[PDB]
Amino acid sequence: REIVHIQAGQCGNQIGAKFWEVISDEHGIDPTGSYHGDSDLQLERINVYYNEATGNKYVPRAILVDLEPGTMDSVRSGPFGQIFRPDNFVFGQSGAGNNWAKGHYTEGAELVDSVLDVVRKESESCDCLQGFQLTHSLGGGTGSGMGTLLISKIREEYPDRIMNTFSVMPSPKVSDTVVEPYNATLSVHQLVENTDETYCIDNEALYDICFRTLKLTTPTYGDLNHLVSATMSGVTTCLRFPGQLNADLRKLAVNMVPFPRLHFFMPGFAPLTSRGSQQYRALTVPELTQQMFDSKNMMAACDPRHGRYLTVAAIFRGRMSMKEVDEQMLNVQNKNSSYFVEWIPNNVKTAVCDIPPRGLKMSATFIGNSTAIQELFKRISEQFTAMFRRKAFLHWYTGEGMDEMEFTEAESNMNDLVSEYQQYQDA
Amino acid sequence: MRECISIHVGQAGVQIGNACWELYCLEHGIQPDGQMPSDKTIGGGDDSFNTFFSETGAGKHVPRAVFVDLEPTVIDEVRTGTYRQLFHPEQLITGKEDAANNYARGHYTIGKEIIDLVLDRIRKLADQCTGLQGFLVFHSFGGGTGSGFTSLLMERLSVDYGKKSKLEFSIYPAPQVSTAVVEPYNSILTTHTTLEHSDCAFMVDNEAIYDICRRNLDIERPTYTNLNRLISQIVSSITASLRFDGALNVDLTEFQTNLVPYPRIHFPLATYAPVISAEKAYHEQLSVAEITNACFEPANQMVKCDPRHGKYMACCLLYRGDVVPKDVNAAIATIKTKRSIQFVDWCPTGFKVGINYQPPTVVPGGDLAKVQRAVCMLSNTTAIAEAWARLDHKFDLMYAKRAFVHWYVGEGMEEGEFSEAREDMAALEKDYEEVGV
Amino acid sequence: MYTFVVRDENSSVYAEVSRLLLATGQWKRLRKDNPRFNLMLGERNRLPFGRLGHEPGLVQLVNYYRGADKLCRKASLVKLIKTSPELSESCTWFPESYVIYPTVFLAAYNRRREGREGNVWIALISSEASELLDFIDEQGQVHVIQKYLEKPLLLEPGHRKFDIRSWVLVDHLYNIYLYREGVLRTSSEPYNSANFQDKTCHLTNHCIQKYGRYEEGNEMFFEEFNQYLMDALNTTLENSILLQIKHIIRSCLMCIEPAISTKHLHYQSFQLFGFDFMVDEELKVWLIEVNGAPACAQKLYAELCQGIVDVAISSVFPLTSIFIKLHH
Amino acid sequence: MEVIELNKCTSGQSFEVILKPPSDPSLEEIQKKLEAAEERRKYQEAELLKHLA
Ligand SMILES: Nc1nc2c(ncn2[C@@H]2O[C@H](COP(=O)(O)OP(=O)(O)OP(=O)(O)O)[C@@H](O)[C@H]2O)c(=O)[nH]1
Ligand SMILES: Nc1ncnc2c1ncn2[C@@H]1O[C@H](COP(=O)(O)OP(=O)(O)CP(=O)(O)O)[C@@H](O)[C@H]1O
Ligand SMILES: Nc1nc2c(ncn2[C@@H]2O[C@H](COP(=O)(O)OP(=O)(O)O)[C@@H](O)[C@H]2O)c(=O)[nH]1
Ligand SMILES: COc1ccc2c(c1)NC(=O)CN2c1nc(Cl)nc2ccc(F)cc12
Numbered sequence A: 001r002e003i004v005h006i007q008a009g010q011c012g013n014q015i016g017a018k019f020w021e022v023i024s025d026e027h028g029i030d031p032t033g034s035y036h037g038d039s040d041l042q043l044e045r046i047n048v049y050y051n052e053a054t055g056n057k058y059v060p061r062a063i064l065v066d067l068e069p070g071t072m073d074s075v076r077s078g079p080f081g082q083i084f085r086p087d088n089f090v091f092g093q094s095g096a097g098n099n100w101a102k103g104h105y106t107e108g109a110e111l112v113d114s115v116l117d118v119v120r121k122e123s124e125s126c127d128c129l130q131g132f133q134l135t136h137s138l139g140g141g142t143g144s145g146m147g148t149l150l151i152s153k154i155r156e157e158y159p160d161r162i163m164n165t166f167s168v169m170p171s172p173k174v175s176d177t178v179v180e181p182y183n184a185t186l187s188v189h190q191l192v193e194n195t196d197e198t199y200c201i202d203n204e205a206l207y208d209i210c211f212r213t214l215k216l217t218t219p220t221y222g223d224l225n226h227l228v229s230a231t232m233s234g235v236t237t238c239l240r241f242p243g244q245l246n247a248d249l250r251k252l253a254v255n256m257v258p259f260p261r262l263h264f265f266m267p268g269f270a271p272l273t274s275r276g277s278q279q280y281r282a283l284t285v286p287e288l289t290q291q292m293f294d295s296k297n298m299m300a301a302c303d304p305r306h307g308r309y310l311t312v313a314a315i316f317r318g319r320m321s322m323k324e325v326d327e328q329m330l331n332v333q334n335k336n337s338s339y340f341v342e343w344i345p346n347n348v349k350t351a352v353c354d355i356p357p358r359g360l361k362m363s364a365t366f367i368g369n370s371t372a373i374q375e376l377f378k379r380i381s382e383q384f385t386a387m388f389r390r391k392a393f394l395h396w397y398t399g400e401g402m403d404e405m406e407f408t409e410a411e412s413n414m415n416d417l418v419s420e421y422q423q424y425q426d427a
Numbered sequence B: 001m002r003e004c005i006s007i008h009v010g011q012a013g014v015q016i017g018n019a020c021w022e023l024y025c026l027e028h029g030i031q032p033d034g035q036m037p038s039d040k041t042i043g044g045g046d047d048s049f050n051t052f053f054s055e056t057g058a059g060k061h062v063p064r065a066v067f068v069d070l071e072p073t074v075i076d077e078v079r080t081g082t083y084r085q086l087f088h089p090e091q092l093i094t095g096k097e098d099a100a101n102n103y104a105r106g107h108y109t110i111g112k113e114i115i116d117l118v119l120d121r122i123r124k125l126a127d128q129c130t131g132l133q134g135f136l137v138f139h140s141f142g143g144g145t146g147s148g149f150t151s152l153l154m155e156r157l158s159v160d161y162g163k164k165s166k167l168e169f170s171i172y173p174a175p176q177v178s179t180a181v182v183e184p185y186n187s188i189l190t191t192h193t194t195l196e197h198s199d200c201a202f203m204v205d206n207e208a209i210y211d212i213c214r215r216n217l218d219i220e221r222p223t224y225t226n227l228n229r230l231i232s233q234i235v236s237s238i239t240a241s242l243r244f245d246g247a248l249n250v251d252l253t254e255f256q257t258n259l260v261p262y263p264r265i266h267f268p269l270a271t272y273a274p275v276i277s278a279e280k281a282y283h284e285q286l287s288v289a290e291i292t293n294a295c296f297e298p299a300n301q302m303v304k305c306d307p308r309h310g311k312y313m314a315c316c317l318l319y320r321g322d323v324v325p326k327d328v329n330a331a332i333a334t335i336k337t338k339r340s341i342q343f344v345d346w347c348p349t350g351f352k353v354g355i356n357y358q359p360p361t362v363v364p365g366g367d368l369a370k371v372q373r374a375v376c377m378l379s380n381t382t383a384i385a386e387a388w389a390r391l392d393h394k395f396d397l398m399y400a401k402r403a404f405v406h407w408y409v410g411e412g413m414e415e416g417e418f419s420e421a422r423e424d425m426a427a428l429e430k431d432y433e434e435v436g437v
Numbered sequence C: 001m002y003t004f005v006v007r008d009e010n011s012s013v014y015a016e017v018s019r020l021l022l023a024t025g026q027w028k029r030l031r032k033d034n035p036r037f038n039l040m041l042g043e044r045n046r047l048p049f050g051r052l053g054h055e056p057g058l059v060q061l062v063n064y065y066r067g068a069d070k071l072c073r074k075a076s077l078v079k080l081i082k083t084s085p086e087l088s089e090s091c092t093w094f095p096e097s098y099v100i101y102p103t104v105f106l107a108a109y110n111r112r113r114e115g116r117e118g119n120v121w122i123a124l125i126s127s128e129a130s131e132l133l134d135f136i137d138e139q140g141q142v143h144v145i146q147k148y149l150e151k152p153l154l155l156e157p158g159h160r161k162f163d164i165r166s167w168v169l170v171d172h173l174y175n176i177y178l179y180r181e182g183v184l185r186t187s188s189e190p191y192n193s194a195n196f197q198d199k200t201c202h203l204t205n206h207c208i209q210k211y212g213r214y215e216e217g218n219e220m221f222f223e224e225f226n227q228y229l230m231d232a233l234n235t236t237l238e239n240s241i242l243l244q245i246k247h248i249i250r251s252c253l254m255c256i257e258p259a260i261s262t263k264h265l266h267y268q269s270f271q272l273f274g275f276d277f278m279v280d281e282e283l284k285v286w287l288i289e290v291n292g293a294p295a296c297a298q299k300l301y302a303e304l305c306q307g308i309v310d311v312a313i314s315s316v317f318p319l320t321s322i323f324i325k326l327h328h
Numbered sequence D: 001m002e003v004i005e006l007n008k009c010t011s012g013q014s015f016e017v018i019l020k021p022p023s024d025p026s027l028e029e030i031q032k033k034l035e036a037a038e039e040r041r042k043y044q045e046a047e048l049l050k051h052l053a
């Protein structure tokens, strides 16, 4: 069951690149593609993410896409840059100028077919293709506008494969330009329709976690992206490693998504760590469990106590008692049973994998489908209409073909989405 | 002699099938390559074990088994396991994409493309049978393959073999070892569509097996191999009469005759004692009366419920080991006084007893200790309807919001089959409650 | 922190159990349909016993005993007395009773006719059968009829009837706990023999007293009544009545222990019972009704509901005595 | 308590004990309903492809 990875634009390629570093280290694959690991657990499911090349080398099933040659050249120059199959670098030259319209309708249109061709070559190699996972941000133009255009086209060619994204939410605390709320509202409309699973990586939550909890006074994208690679390794654990679960994207979607549009997950991680500095006490299973449910460990700036958990998946990494995991997990439910819906019995599921991630002896990754994610979609809807009620900055988009109407629809679909999350917070 | 074909469906079906077939081989002295030293009718026989095995011109003993999983991972471990030589490649049928815990995906979408290939390898086995009795079908209620493909298979079998019996061993869904939140949808759906196609079904609630494994085996977090070795013990107990000399439950029709007076209410409760840990160095061997009494304790039942608050319509005691009729009747008489055993008025209060002198077999290096005598009670008590209420409540909770329904409709199914399957279940709980008040 | 739901909103008693429980700061009330409870203060009819004890990591306890109804329904209490050998068709503490449906009573009524002995009965009190048997069909449901106690013990001053309610608590371990405070529900109306249609003088129902003359709320607690026995009869409550009450409570609940014990069950029951007794003129105690959903008397609510919490609830979920353990 | 049908052999014995006396659809219909769900599927999928268009 192969997965096809796609990373698009400045942000999607920078986090895209860290993911492949991180998990290439966990599977003992080095920057040349040669395996040098200890456990067989590292290669039993290597094919989910890697293609096996002649000479028994491993090549990520990764398609790298940008409207600009900038970041993508930095990937090729990066530590694992040589691991990526070079034919899979697809890129224009004009850039997308942080403009959703250029990504989706003008500039991205030129380039999308060439991306769809590399996607096709990869899919055909595939034995049983589960689907796709995309890394992008919603606040610029390539990953946001072109990214969702790809997602639309992939779903037309492969209507019955799973579509998974890692979508970075914009935030005034980490913002390139003032049109990010416009770009993200337009994308969120796309995502509600055309993905099975999206992980809401909020840059607001990454920022606070960097500032308040890691005490980083002035956090770079590299600090934010350390958090993003930790969560990304986490949520993909039960797909890359052998365990009792041995999950795939579809079973994941079936059990997490009770209603098709409510497929926006809050990720969470524990222990929160800051790059380089390693602390030396491992956590106790009770600590992982309290921290991982802690709002301070959520990667989407939502208060879980303001919503109800529709469903929950939790993944524990390291040598530890599955008895104490069972006990610590049963205890946080029955302590805070108010915050889980009664009408999906037994909606918290847990898995364990022996291999911990690099640097830590024990770790807990949290995947929550909480109705409190509406707080995110409200935050962005507020910034959206704060400008749109004055039609501010709109010309950047009417200049590339778009109509005011298209904004009213996207705005409207998102307010609908927030109403839908609100319906089940009372049910 | 009349042959019986075993069909193992889904992960739960296949892994339990492995557990059983390995146990069978131990009990019948067959080896991992299918050579049975003790068989002297080489390349044939109408012995009693020949109901579950065929012989080969080269004297191999081959399960009358078909394994079928919508996905290759589990049946592959069979294809490469200690008993790889036992089975014949075309009896291990695997798909490529599984049902994703989706009743509708296993029944309609992926079911339709394999239902023919499967009924063909099945008929390839029915053709080496001189007088086929019918089928033993092993499956989970919860898995999409377990629930959805099984009811599509059950429907065709009723068609191609209208005269042969079909018995079920069904794993009922328990949250502790459960992988999916939609198991109650799949359970109701598959019960409704299988009800009139199954002659007798033995439910095994994973909750009950799990706690027997913790309590009586001192296993902290029971694995599937813990639960499956214990579950095949019970299965062996229930099938021994088909595979051994005897006069009770000699054919699959007797199971319906002895345990199923009304045809819908065909879910006999199984109780098993004694379950004794192999780590216990010093164990005092339990008596006929002690182990017959353990059959009326809920903590030994395959499903947790309270038979005191229901009524019986039938009862079998299946003993294995050092047991004589006199000890049984003294233990029955002693127990009758102290226990609350109420039959329906149209049924005689009384037990059909069966004794096999070969004591239970324990796979070397398992968790069960050898014991001098064991027993497995099969009782058709209305108190098992408790499990239907549990399952049906969980289903009403999700379905009131129509949570997850879209996954099903999106494969073909109609919201209607949901309420239709739930009304059958509502019929079923009313049937039970009639009989038991 | 333990958790508990509430499903009988009319429960005067567990209204108070709920109150006190919260005020420990170690108990939390969930929504009635929340399954993740430790403690079910349950409903009176169709309590869903088949759903208790299937929540991993949750020790579940409930405040009723599945099967207990057999002791708390007029018609089934009679069937229990005759069929259970432990009680025997001969027990000396139960009045003669028959179950007659409306679509051997007469036999014994005629052996009484042959002696012209008292032949009053109850449902509703008559003296001629035809008077009574025609009543049960006038309702349509099952009724039971019982030797009326023509010669009851009457307190003076007043020449007045009464019944005794003892509150009994059975815990998850099947210890039997009798509450030290009992209550006499007393009629303020001089029992008159010939006029058996004089309700309020024959039926000592607190409600039926729709009063207050001799005792507040036609209710006499144990200190008062023992003193009256001592003065008026030269005896004591223990000797003349209580010994026989503890024998009856013990006997009834020992009988049905195999049918309702939750000793090896996956969930657990406790339950509070109200036992109602009739003391005749010879100082003999009689069992009338066993009530499965009993209201306490206001003066004692504070005491009895705190004793439930100690003996039945904190025994299982930990955070001189007001009961007499009845030993078996 | 009445034993009733003691049958013995070398493997064991069997018998009853009375404590007290008393007081399908077609292959076509399968393929029809099945193929109705595959049409319901192809409809829903053609609407998706229509909307994408
Ligand atoms: N006792 C026991 N139960 C099992 C075993 N394997 C799976 N189960 C139960 O089966 C339920 C799910 O059904 P599965 O058989 O695993 O699913 P499936 O039949 O493979 O169908 P798919 O959805 O296509 O995977 C779970 O709730 C498990 O508790 C097993 O080996 N032993
Ligand atoms: N055999 C008998 N002889 C004499 N008096 C009797 C009697 N049986 C009952 N009584 C009296 O008549 C009353 C009959 O009413 P009954 O006992 O049914 O009310 P009750 O006990 O059901 C109310 P509660 O359920 O609240 O205790 C009894 O309470 C008692 O006062
Ligand atoms: N967490 C994180 N966010 C980023 C990173 N780079 C850009 N972003 C966010 O993405 C938005 C800009 O979109 P971007 O991807 O750079 O434009 P694009 O190249 O056209 O796709 C801004 O709001 C940033 O906050 C990164 O490395 N990490
Ligand atoms: C809430 O109910 C479920 C939630 C999630 C899942 C599931 C049921 N059952 C499945 O088969 C897929 N699966 C998971 N999938 C993936 Cl990719 N990672 C996981 C990590 C941890 C974990 F506990 C489950 C999963």
Ligand SMILES: [Ca+2]
Pocket (backbone or CB within 6 Å): B039, B040, B041, B042, B044, B045, B046, B047, B055
């Ligand atoms: Ca032979």
Ligand SMILES: [Mg+2]
Pocket (backbone or CB within 6 Å): A010, A140, A176
């Ligand atoms: Mg930028």
Ligand SMILES: [Mg+2]
Pocket (backbone or CB within 6 Å): B010, B011, B069, B071, B074, B098, B145
């Ligand atoms: Mg499977």
